[PDB]
Amino acid sequence: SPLVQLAGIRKCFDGKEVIPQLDLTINNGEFLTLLGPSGCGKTTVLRLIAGLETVDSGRIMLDNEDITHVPAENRYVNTVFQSYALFPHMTVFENVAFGLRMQKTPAAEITPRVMEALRMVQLETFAQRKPHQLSGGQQQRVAIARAVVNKPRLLLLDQSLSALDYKLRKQMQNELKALQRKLGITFVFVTHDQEEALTMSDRIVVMRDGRIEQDGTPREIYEEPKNLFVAGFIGEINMFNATVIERLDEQRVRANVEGRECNIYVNFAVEPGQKLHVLLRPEDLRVEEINDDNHAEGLIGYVRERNYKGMTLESVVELENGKMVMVSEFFNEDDPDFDHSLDQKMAINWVESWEVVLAD
Amino acid sequence: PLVQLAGIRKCFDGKEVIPQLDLTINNGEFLTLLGPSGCGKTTVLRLIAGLETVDSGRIMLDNEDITHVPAENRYVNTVFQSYALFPHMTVFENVAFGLRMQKTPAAEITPRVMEALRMVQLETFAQRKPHQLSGGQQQRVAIARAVVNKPRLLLLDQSLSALDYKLRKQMQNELKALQRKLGITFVFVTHDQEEALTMSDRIVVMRDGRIEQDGTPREIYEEPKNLFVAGFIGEINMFNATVIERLDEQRVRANVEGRECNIYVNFAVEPGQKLHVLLRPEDLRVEEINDDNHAEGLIGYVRERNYKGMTLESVVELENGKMVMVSEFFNEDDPDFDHSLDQKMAINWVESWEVVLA
Amino acid sequence: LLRGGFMTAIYAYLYIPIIILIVNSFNSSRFGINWQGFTTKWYSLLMNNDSLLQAAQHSLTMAVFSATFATLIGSLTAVALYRYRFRGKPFVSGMLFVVMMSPDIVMAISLLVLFMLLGIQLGFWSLLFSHITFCLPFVVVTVYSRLKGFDVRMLEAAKDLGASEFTILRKIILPLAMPAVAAGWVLSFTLSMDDVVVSSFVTGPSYEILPLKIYSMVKVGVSPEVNALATILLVLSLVMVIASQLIAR
Amino acid sequence: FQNVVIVTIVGWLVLFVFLPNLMIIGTSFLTRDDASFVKMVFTLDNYTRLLDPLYFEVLLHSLNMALIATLACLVLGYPFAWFLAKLPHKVRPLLLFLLIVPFWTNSLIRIYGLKIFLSTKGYLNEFLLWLGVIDTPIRIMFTPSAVIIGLVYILLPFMVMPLYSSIEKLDKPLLEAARDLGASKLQTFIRIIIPLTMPGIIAGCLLVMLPAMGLFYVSDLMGGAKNLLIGNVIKVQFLNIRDWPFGAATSITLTIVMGLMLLVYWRASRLLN
Ligand SMILES: [Mg+2]
Ligand SMILES: [Mg+2]
Ligand SMILES: [Mg+2]
Ligand SMILES: [Mg+2]
């Protein structure tokens, strides 16, 4: 069931095409995250939906009703700002009741709704305090309660938890996901953080320079990238070069990678002489001894640096050709059999069917 | 011994920020002061730099007292959080300010400034105002300004906090190499634990103006001293236990959460004493269903599986009502991974790999 | 201690003449140089003087009216500049800056020639217009400085919550800008009560104020009745400032 | 809403400030008449008469007298603003308010009071003799020194406030960085503080120099007939002799100086930003 349908959205600001052309659909009852580098244009889409900006050309729907030109006062869309946009003189109670008062709500219902909204975010006893008497985590909850009390069809969040510390951010990442399920309305989130998007979202859209690169579930993004930018942006990847020699069967293809031959799993059709990119992640590579290898063929290289990062050990490995390859693994210092040698000939291997093959 | 602090006290608006602090900073090392927000690290840094005056105690630098010496006469230079960066001067003059103001002969100013700018890879942006540069450039200008006077100790105050995630990872290694190249001591104040683990040679943990632990990055993560340091550096699981009898000099039998197991204790204990057993989330294994005479020790149900990209966190619930929060890697293309949700499960560890506290 | 002593000297510099004219009010000597006893005669003679009291009333009326109109126009202009973002804002700021940093003699003679090229008699209206003209920039600057210390996203937040513009200017901006409005009123009142140069150019015999009335008496000699007027005007002007703070509170 | 306020404020300024100024500059080029005031005959006699020695010595005297008053305000005003910036935030507004309390009494009465205070047989001469600092009475009335004392009195508050605003907007870390790198208090002032607060100095100078060249009641009451300011010359030509074109020619010199100081302000701001 579609809720917002953007068709042919364009916008130009000061002789700059921020949004060339965008087609997007937002369903009902999900958590959606717009993620990308700085300056890709997520805030423009958010403001166009909210109504604080007007589109140069295109069409916008909400529940099969055209709101392209309806002003940003009659739409059923509410927004949470980055700076929390709080009125200083008003109290918490009046901050929450602002939207209800300017909707001509009957006076009898105002107090129970406001108290319920404050209870939803655990702030029922700070009703009569004012801002500047509250911490950041409290002001954020006041903003969310002010946005949610009008029963909107859609809630927009713009980098909401950016200014906070680590553990408090981790805890509110979970309360927001619980609140979305408790209410039952669509959330649209804009963030620059990768792990934050991967944790709390049910559908991720990656944006670069005003265009959509990939849309899918978090697993479909971290595990099956579509191009090189998406693979390198979320997570961290190793780029290998390949040339196709021959095909054995429908799903296994022989090719050389950096001067060594091994089998790779390719599903789409290829022809001999074609160049490919084989992508592997740090946690999927294994460094093993070659003196008693007697297992299979693999890459040869030396270990230059061993970095201790707490829970994980990151190793920088130099191949014979000269490309940098980095391997990650857990640190078990109480294991008697733990490799620690440096500047030695050791092999690099990976388990079959764990690669991501992308054509060029 | 470079800087020795004995009995330093400081009060600001009546509230004590440093009760009593004893510390010794050696020569040729990387030291990081790590702790929660508002614990008096910045006060220590400013006290050493000379921008504040102590209420009691002594400060020494190479066995000469500098408690009352003003900041212009100390051989200590500081990099500020906001990159002071005088707006009406070029980069060349920014770097050459300190040389110009110590009455230095004019022949040596240009080569020294050029070399300092070269060490931070800014030799071609010599004539540009500090508004045509970006964050990294401004940071490198600040570092070059600090290190051109040849100081005996460089102080850094949350230097790389405002940058992005990839530039941070690059400049951490860059600073770690620069320290070895120069040969002087660095003192760094940070709020991020990963930076302290990956960049330091000695970490000092502070809380409410007091020292909790001091040692190698390995010691803090692997051998915490009290319950605060564990759980601040990473995630911890605190299990209660009761000692029964001492099997030998190394292993002691105990009752953990209503079940019996053998644990390693390295100090004297007596039956009836209460013990704390700490285990990291990634050292715990949720193995197959309870097999007779194969796996024993704990019983619990999964109750959740959270996907976080590289790793997968499962918060299991025991028989008593406690969470355990197991962590592990996510291998999807491996055709034996378990996706079970709410049946009887087993919790084990490796008979060691545990930290026992009194 | 040396820092505190310097600050006292500057305050003692400005306040000493006021103390002298207050004290010499009770003096018996007409010239005021020496002290020759305590008399109350000057206040009684002032009470029976008509032209002096009329001039004082005219000055106070001009001050109140000019302050009110300047406060209104300047507050509206400041809200306009702060609320919107447009291309012409630097130009308006520059015009206001140039108006503020202009000689008073040029501004007086320009208004004289303008009012003589339009056949407008010199009196109430010319004086009121001149006072408003040279009081506006300070009000604009005060209110703009007060308003720029708050986030501008609150207006967008009010829009998203379903508030029209007039509601936004009747519920958000005004309570945050009232203490600046009171200060603007007080500053305009002071500036209109102090000026002597413009009034001596753009006025006429029909409307007489205190500056020219005292200037006329200078050629013959200033009786201590003027000192008796100045002390009362201090108390009356004091209570007006006290009232303004309470109303704004 | 948006258009109404902008048109009204722009219409008010163009009608009352800018357009009349173009009338004054255009009046300096026409020809005098007894009953018609200005006559439409383009002449350059007005500007060339300013080069006569009689009317050129008066202009030179005013510049010297106003320039020293500006310097005296800067020397006594920068320290006052600096010390007011090292005080608790609550007491600062009260101290600033106590600077405009004297303004409620009119300016033409406060100079009359100061004249009595500085007279030969008045106070400040009896007290000094009683203390014994001086031996014979000090006579400074009807001298160039008296005018400069009076001008500093009236216009001193106008210089303090621009300077206090610039000082309070300074960045504390910038002052701490210099101290770390080896700057004495003197070298910080010459190389950092003064360049960062230069627009505040130029703003204060404009508000104290130009108004000090038009105060005619200070010269009349404290200076005499030998020491006159430009405002006395303009006043006579506009209200007694009724030679309006000459008054416009004299007033141009004040306008020309305004442009020079304004240009410095724009150039000082661009370099700083
Ligand atoms: Mg480990
Ligand atoms: Mg896979
Ligand atoms: Mg994986
Ligand atoms: Mg261990």
Numbering used by the authors:
A (entry chain A): 15 to 374
B (entry chain D): 16 to 373
C (entry chain C): 5 to 253
D (entry chain B): 7 to 279
Authors' own words:
We also successfully modeled the structure of the PotABC complex with the bound ligand Spd. In the Spd-bound complex, one Spd molecule is enclosed within the membrane cavity, formed mainly by transmembrane helices 3 to 5 (TM3 to TM5) of both PotB and PotC. The residues S113 and Y223 in PotB, along with D198 in PotC, establish interactions with Spd amine at one end, while residues M104, S106, and D108 in PotC interact with the other end. D108 also interacts with the middle amine group. In addition, residues I160, F164, and L213 in PotB engage in hydrophobic interactions with the carbon atoms of Spd. Together, PotB (F164 and L213) and PotC (F142 and L191) block Spd exit into the cytosol. In particular, the residue Y223 in PotB faces inward to form a hydrogen-bonding interaction with the Spd terminal amide group. As the translocation pathway opens further on the cytoplasmic side, the residues (PotB F164 and L213; and PotC F142 and L191) move apart, allowing Spd to be released to the cytosol.
The PotD-PotABC protein complex in Escherichia coli, belonging to the adenosine triphosphate–binding cassette transporter family, is a spermidine-preferential uptake system. In general, ATP binding, hydrolysis, and phosphate release trigger conformational changes in the transporter, leading to the uptake of extracellular polyamines.
